[PDB]
Amino acid sequence: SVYKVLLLGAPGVGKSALARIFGGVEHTYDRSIVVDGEEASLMVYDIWLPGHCMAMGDAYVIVYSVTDKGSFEKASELRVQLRRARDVPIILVGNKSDLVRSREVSVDEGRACAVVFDCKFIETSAALHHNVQALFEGVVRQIRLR
Ligand SMILES: Nc1nc2c(ncn2[C@@H]2O[C@H](COP(=O)(O)OP(=O)(O)O)[C@@H](O)[C@H]2O)c(=O)[nH]1
Numbered sequence: 091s092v093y094k095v096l097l098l099g100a101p102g103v104g105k106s107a108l109a110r111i112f113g114g115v116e117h118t119y120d121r122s123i124v125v126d127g128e129e130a131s132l133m134v135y136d137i138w139l140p141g142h143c144m145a146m147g148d149a150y151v152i153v154y155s156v157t158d159k160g161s162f163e164k165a166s167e168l169r170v171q172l173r174r175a176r177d178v179p180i181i182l183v184g185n186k187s188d189l190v191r192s193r194e195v196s197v198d199e200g201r202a203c204a205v206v207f208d209c210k211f212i213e214t215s216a217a218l219h220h221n222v223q224a225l226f227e228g229v230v231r232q233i234r235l236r
């Protein structure tokens with residue numbers, strides 16, 4: 091299967107950092123990955139014309155930075171905007187988990203946001219490559235489920 095995934099979020103949260111790691115780069119990315127014994131190719135659009143960007147993907151990844159409370163609030167704005175434009179899979183991502191001292195958003199607040207959105211939540215660190223692979227395999231699983 092071939093899927094389009096759009097990365098949404100406030101500037102500076104790590105969208106491009108996460109896309110490049112997935113794409114294997116040091117825009118858009120493609121890459122086939124095997125999830126649960128089945129291969130799937132994901133086309134990741136790191137392009138966040140808001141209306142135009144929101145009317146495409148087969149899934150959306152809303153990213154905020156755990157060190158930026160404002161970016162977390164922006165995640166809620168994006169979810170509302172998305173509801174006004176599109177039952178497509180949404181994954182909420184709290185990035186920069188490695189910056190422990192500068193955290194501004196707790197893991198609990200992230201999990202609570204996910205309960206409100208009724209979506210999957212994961213925390214990542216583009217700096218350490220932690221949970222990056224898990225994020226995209228998760229997008230594939232959520233798409234198949236829907
Ligand atoms: N320490 C740390 N820095 C990160 C992480 N992800 C992104 N950054 C940094 O945050 C800034 C914004 O990164 P960028 O990928 O351009 O975010 P974008 O604007 O959402 O695309 C850069 O200074 C990155 O080096 C992370 O997981 N840990």
Ligand SMILES: [Mg+2]
Binds near residue numbers: 105106107
């Ligand atoms: Mg970027």
